[PDB]
Enzyme design. Structure first.
Site, PDB file in Angstrom:
ATOM      1  N   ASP A 132      -6.889   6.668  -4.535  1.00 36.88           N
ATOM      2  CA  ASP A 132      -6.200   5.549  -4.786  1.00 36.88           C
ATOM      3  C   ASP A 132      -6.362   5.300  -6.207  1.00 36.88           C
ATOM      4  O   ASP A 132      -7.146   5.637  -7.011  1.00 36.88           O
ATOM      5  CB  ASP A 132      -6.202   4.675  -3.928  1.00 36.88           C
ATOM      6  CG  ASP A 132      -8.667   3.977  -4.122  1.00 36.88           C
ATOM      7  OD1 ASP A 132      -9.094   4.462  -5.228  1.00 36.88           O
ATOM      8  OD2 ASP A 132      -8.729   3.346  -2.807  1.00 36.88           O
ATOM      9  N   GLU A 148       1.201  -1.168  -0.366  1.00 37.56           N
ATOM     10  CA  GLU A 148       0.507  -0.521   0.030  1.00 37.56           C
ATOM     11  C   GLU A 148       0.639   1.130   0.084  1.00 37.56           C
ATOM     12  O   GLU A 148       0.207   2.157  -0.230  1.00 37.56           O
ATOM     13  CB  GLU A 148      -0.901   0.139   1.433  1.00 37.56           C
ATOM     14  CG  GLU A 148      -1.369  -1.030   1.169  1.00 37.56           C
ATOM     15  CD  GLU A 148      -2.534  -1.040   0.346  1.00 37.56           C
ATOM     16  OE1 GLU A 148      -3.292   0.840  -0.415  1.00 37.56           O
ATOM     17  OE2 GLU A 148      -3.962  -2.054   0.082  1.00 37.56           O
TER      18      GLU A 148
END
Ligand code: CL
Ligand code: CL
EC number: 3.2.1.17
Length: 162
Positions: free
Chosen positions: A20, A11
């Site tokens: 994202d 991540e």
């Protein structure tokens, strides 16, 4: 290697609100803030999550604290899920990390939906489950990360992360 180190590799870490891969407002270590298009709704959630007026930015410790909660929530979600729990129980320590990873990324509901692959994992049919897991939007959308997780399920080692 452990689940935290693994997810930190997958991540990344960002101290300012960002979008994202799906375009949602995120912060820290993959911590989803909101699916709403508003940066303000994002800043509000953030302040709610941290307990302070952040103006969209947090420190490392704040990021790590959110991260600890999310991993914990992930594991507990799996253990409360009637479809997931049995899979997890059946798995070795490495493979368990792979399933937690998927749940952190796509939520319990999403993973719970991989019916066929879950059954293949439960039966310890590694090769077959790896092929089945690849026929998914997930894999098509985030091919590099999906490949790492999938390799972890196939092999039961941390090679993809070394
Ligand atoms: Cl939260
Ligand atoms: Cl990717």
């Amino acid at each position: 290697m452990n689940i935290f180190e693994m997810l930190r590799i997958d991540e990344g870490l960002r101290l300012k609100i960002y979008k994202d891969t799906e375009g949602y407002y995120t912060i820290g270590i993959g911590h989803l803030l909101t699916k709403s298009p508003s940066l303000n709704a994002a800043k509000s959630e953030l302040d709610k999550a941290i307990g302070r007026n952040t103006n969209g930015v947090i420190d490392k410790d704040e990021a790590e604290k959110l991260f600890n909660q999310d991993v914990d929530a992930a594991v507990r979600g799996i253990l409360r899920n009637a479809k997931l729990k049995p899979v997890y129980d059946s798995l070795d320590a490495v493979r368990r990390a792979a399933l937690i990873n998927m749940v952190f990324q796509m939520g319990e509901t999403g993973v719970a939906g991989f019916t066929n692959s879950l059954r293949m994992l439960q039966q310890k049919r590694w090769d077959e489950a790896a092929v089945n897991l690849a026929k998914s939007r997930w894999y098509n959308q985030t091919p590099n990360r999906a490949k790492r997780v999938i390799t972890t399920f196939r092999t039961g080692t941390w090679d993809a992360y070394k």
